[PDB]
Design a protein around this nucleic acid. Sequence first.
RNA 1: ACUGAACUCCUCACACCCAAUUGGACCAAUCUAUCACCCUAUAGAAGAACUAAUGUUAGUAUAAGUAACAUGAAAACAUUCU
Lengths: 148, 98, 166, 39, 300, 152, 266
Amino acid sequence: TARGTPSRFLASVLHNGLGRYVQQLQRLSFSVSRDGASSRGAREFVEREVIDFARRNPGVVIYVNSRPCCVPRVVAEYLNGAVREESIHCKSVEEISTLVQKLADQSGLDVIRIRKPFHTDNPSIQGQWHPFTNKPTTFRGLRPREVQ
Amino acid sequence: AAPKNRRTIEVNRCRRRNPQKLIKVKNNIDVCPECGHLKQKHVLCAYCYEKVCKETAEIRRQIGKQEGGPFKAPTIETVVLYTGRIIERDRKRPSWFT
Amino acid sequence: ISRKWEKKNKIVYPPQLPGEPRRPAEIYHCRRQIKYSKDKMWYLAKLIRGMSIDQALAQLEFNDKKGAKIIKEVLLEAQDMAVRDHNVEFRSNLYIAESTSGRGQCLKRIRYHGRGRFGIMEKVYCHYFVKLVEGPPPPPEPPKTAVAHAKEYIQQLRSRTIVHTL
Amino acid sequence: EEGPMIEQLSKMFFTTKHRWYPHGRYHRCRKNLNPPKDR
Amino acid sequence: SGTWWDEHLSEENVPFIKQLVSDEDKAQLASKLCPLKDEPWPIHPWEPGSFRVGLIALKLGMMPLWTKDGQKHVVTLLQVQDCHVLKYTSKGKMATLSVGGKTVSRFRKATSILEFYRELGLPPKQTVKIFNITDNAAIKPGTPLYAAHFRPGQYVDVTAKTIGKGFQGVMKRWGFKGQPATHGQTKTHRRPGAVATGDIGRVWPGTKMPGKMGNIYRTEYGLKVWRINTKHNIIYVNGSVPGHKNCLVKVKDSKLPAYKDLGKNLPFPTYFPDGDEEELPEDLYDENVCQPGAPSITFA
Amino acid sequence: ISHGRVFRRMGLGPESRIHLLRNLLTGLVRHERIEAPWARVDEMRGYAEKLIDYGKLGDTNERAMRMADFWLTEKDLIPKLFQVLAPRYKDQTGGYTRMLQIPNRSLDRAKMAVIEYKGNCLPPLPLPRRDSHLTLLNQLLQGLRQDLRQSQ
Amino acid sequence: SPTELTEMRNDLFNKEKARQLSLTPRTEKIEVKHVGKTDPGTVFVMNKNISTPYSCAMHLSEWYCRKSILALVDGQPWDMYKPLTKSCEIKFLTFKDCDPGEVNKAYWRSCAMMMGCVIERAFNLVRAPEVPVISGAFCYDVVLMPTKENLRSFTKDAHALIYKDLPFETLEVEAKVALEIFQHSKYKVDFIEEKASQNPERIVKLHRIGDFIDVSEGPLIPRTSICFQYEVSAVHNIRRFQGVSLPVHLRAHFTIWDKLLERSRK
RNA sequence: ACUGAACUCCUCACACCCAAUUGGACCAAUCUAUCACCCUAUAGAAGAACUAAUGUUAGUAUAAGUAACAUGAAAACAUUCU
Ligand SMILES: [Mg+2]
Ligand SMILES: [Mg+2]
Ligand SMILES: [Mg+2]
Ligand SMILES: [Mg+2]
Ligand SMILES: [Mg+2]
Ligand SMILES: [Mg+2]
Ligand SMILES: [Mg+2]
Ligand SMILES: [Mg+2]
Ligand SMILES: [Zn+2]
């Protein structure tokens, strides 16, 4: 729940949308097994859909280790420093591909509650409401029950 | 009568960690001007009192030795002489018996 | 049975540079399986907590409680250790950083109640723990003034936002 | 002095006594020291 | 470490110091005797809707007084020890006068109080009590008040702290009956019985229960002054007054609407020995009272 | 309630209390010093002073003798009371019995006390002194006194 | 100028201290014995130009530190904070001894110094007179009229100083150095000269309270906090300012205090 | 005229709100067969998953530092006294 989970505000690292959309994904590290059903899907991906993916996004720099791994993992390292580490355990190829795509797309920040689906640097253009907006000035700056 | 529910630990802490039940930090304590072993105001120094007690005990023993059996208690005010009614100790006199 | 407090005296911190704060001597010492109830020990412990060794000693001398003697003994031993083994020069410069009471292993006996019945007496024991640090006893919490409170309130007032809208 | 001080504070700021009384350890531990700040 | 005045003084200094302290107080008292020649304040006349100052006296003991009808009236003796007006405050409802009481060791009094007393004349009194007053009747701080303030025949309210019997049971505190000794009640002879009912899952506020009894303030109203003894500042008041022998009590003109306007003959601010009013007899009696020395009464 | 009520409630009754007191008195007579629990000690002192006063009246008074017999259980002590203590205190009025605290008894942590008849034969108690006259405050006081004297 | 002078003097003092430090070759050790009525017959193995009798006190206990004021080393009073040259015999002195006269004088001197300090800031100082204890005040002579308000202000200043709680720094210095330090004040210079004349070694005793510095004959009390009740009674015509002050360890109590003040006022 | 649901509409997304019962889809641990080799897979099997039985045993709380329980006095630690 929201009370238990640590919260967050909406932002975008280093102002991506302003100038240039920068791929936040640096590295995908593929731990795969040569032998083992654990990583059949992973193996398949390595064989066929990884090269294409790499070609598509050259900002990402993929590593593939083939390290007699009992459970295969794909470590996604991002530009801020955060490391999203996820398993590839007994997944179909398509699913794996989808996961990879998702990893690529998203920013470096935590997958936690966001608080407001919006975030303006400069909200007010006319002026923020003080109580003295929509209040008339009196002559000589006078107030209730005064002398002169 | 019987407790209807278990008293929570927090409650218990509040009850028993409160300043009436905490031990007071006293301020009676001064140094023993002779002997330096530290003592309460309104009380004889424990260490200083000890020597005196010991002395009394030895004197008592000597008195006993002098007065063979029980039921004596003579008609003389006794004096304690160390080395020069009389009770004859030994040693030098301490720096407090005068 | 675990004993980490005892171990704690066997640490070696890597040596200092000339331009560096002194790093005061921390010193850890216990007494195990003291015949007392832990909670009783705790009051004494509390009484000692922030104080200079000397002050603590004085307090213990005149607190008429069984455990007080024991604690005093422990403190004395600690002091001795500091002077000999742990390279603390002044006895007077030791203050009590920490003092706590743990429960020792406890022995079960029968209590023999009226009617056919019986309770189980548990004959209690404590572990007394001390930490002495070198340096004068740190100054306690100065009770926050009205001004401070006011400042805090002001800060709180400032801190608010328009909550939901943007 | 405590109660008097509290009263004074109340007078100053127009508010009840209850907030000026200092809350416990658990609550303070709970409080977030580095909250997520925005804008 | 908290000290006390004596601890540090020598073997030989202490008595001298004590003497000095006594002497200063005595001097102060002496100084305080004559208020009118110093600064009299405006001495205003009596008016219908007026009030005036009271006294703080010591309940000394009781004794029997006899009337010319030949009746016992028990009287408690109230000694007006010192009693100086300490401070005046005009209009949060009415004007008021703080009056003092027994003199007490400045040694044992708080710094703030001590300073205040220094600012005034006087040594530090035991109890300060405030009287509500009308601005007609008003007098300078450090004006000594005497027994002659009250005249025989006048009626009085006396207030004091009742004798404290500590934590008491229900039988003594509230005069409950308790339960019977035999037949046999078990562990219930001096208990309160039922507290209060099933449908209430509660005990009402004010419910009479065992608790600390006495040592609270109580006022007895409309006591007749039978006599005053000017030479000793003793007031003789009919009946019984709250609290113990040697207790400080507060003595004022009575409140009851029967006695609302009987004070025209009384001295309105205070009796001033400085006068002009003539020195009083050794003791003033009410006309009903049989005096000691007068012949043995016979109904002829 | 127990207002204006002298006499603590010592033993298992009043007789018992009296007996206890008597024993203490006897001990004192024997010894000229006793370590004892502070609450009874004061009572003993009170009784003790009275006893000494009685003794002062002299052997030849029968009442006094009777009292002595009652209170000194060991019986050799009566002569001591008459032929020593009384002699010692003929100049004094009621200065006898010196009563001072002892740290605390070890087992039950009672308040303790000493009780010697004044002067006596034993090593002196480490008494509480007043501060010496040469100290700062004391000196100041002395000066003040001198000034006062000069003035008058 | 008053803004310059204080700083300059302080600097000079610091320099002197440094010079003094210079002479000893890297931690020279001496064995200093404790002569005393209690805690005998201890010896402290001290480092000579650095370590004070305060260190010794610390070694013994905290109580000693609290209550010691002068340190009789070879039957002559050192300050608690003035270093122990060579192997010697120490006694520690409280206010509550059989012979507390030495302590009293020191206390008086300290008080005088404090008064002087108060004077210097508040708005030239000739000397602190050597006044006894039965005379019922500690005075200080000053070349410049004050009201009760002024007196109150002075008292407040003193109190503030006490609160601040400064250690009484000490040095026994060459006469030339002393002269250099106080060449602006003529009276002070004269006093220094006199002092020099008095002894065979020139050995002028400079004492310092943080910023303020002064010359005085005797030793001084460790810290300003030992003063508890401190007041400034009156000024009499050079203008002699007077004071009376009782420390912690002998608190007067209200009436008594007032009496003392009155006495001082004469 | 407004307000007003899990009704209805909108952007998405859909197997994902009934007692007993019944039909399904999945699956934690283990053991074996064969795989794998920082803990996995396909199978076969089974003492196969505990927030409740005044459940069992073991520990520890609460009630609780509560109820309750001790050693006649002085001494010289010989003794005496009650
Ligand atoms: Mg049975
Ligand atoms: Mg009945
Ligand atoms: Mg019955
Ligand atoms: Mg709606
Ligand atoms: Mg619907
Ligand atoms: Mg169960
Ligand atoms: Mg209970
Ligand atoms: Mg009980
Ligand atoms: Zn001692």
